[PDB]
Amino acid sequence: EPTLTPDELWLVMESYWKEKGFVRQHLDSYNAFIDHGLQDV
How does it assemble (predicted)? Predict the structure, then answer.
């Protein structure tokens, strides 16, 4: 079978950055500080 191509793998990786953004590390971790950060101190 024509295994995939080097062209269908573009479309899989294209959906990775239009679902979740590029600034993930700041935004996602800070979101947990508002929910579960303040109550534990």
Answer: Part of the RNA polymerase complex.
